[PDB]
């Protein structure tokens, strides 16, 4: 079976390229605005540096 005609088909495909960049502040997330809590968070500072 040999074709005797043709069609020019345009297909659309979508690909995600990136996602929303995000940043997090340990101090104001965990220890919202209290100094007493933020002092206790210093010993865990390494974790946030991760």
């Amino acid at each position: 079976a040999i074709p005797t005609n043709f069609t020019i088909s345009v297909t659309t495909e979508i690909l995600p390229v990136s996602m929303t960049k995000t940043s997090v502040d340990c101090t104001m997330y965990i220890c919202g605005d209290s100094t007493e809590c933020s002092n206790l968070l210093l010993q865990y500072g390494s974790f946030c540096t991760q």
Binding site: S23, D25, T27, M28
Partner: protein, 50 residues
């Protein structure tokens, strides 16, 4: 060299605010601690304080 997100250290508090109800009535400490007669344990007395 680059751009760095930073946590919160620049803000520090310096003043304090207190806001209680304005009441001048001393509370009946003499009517519960200095009461002439106390109740039996089985029929224990209950007093509202407001």
């Amino acid at each position: 060299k680059g751009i760095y997100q930073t946590s919160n250290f620049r803000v520090q508090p310096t003043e304090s605010i207190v806001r209680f109800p304005n009441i001048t009535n001393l509370c009946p400490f003499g009517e519960v601690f200095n009461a002439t007669r106390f109740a039996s344990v089985y029929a224990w007395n209950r007093k509202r304080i407001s």
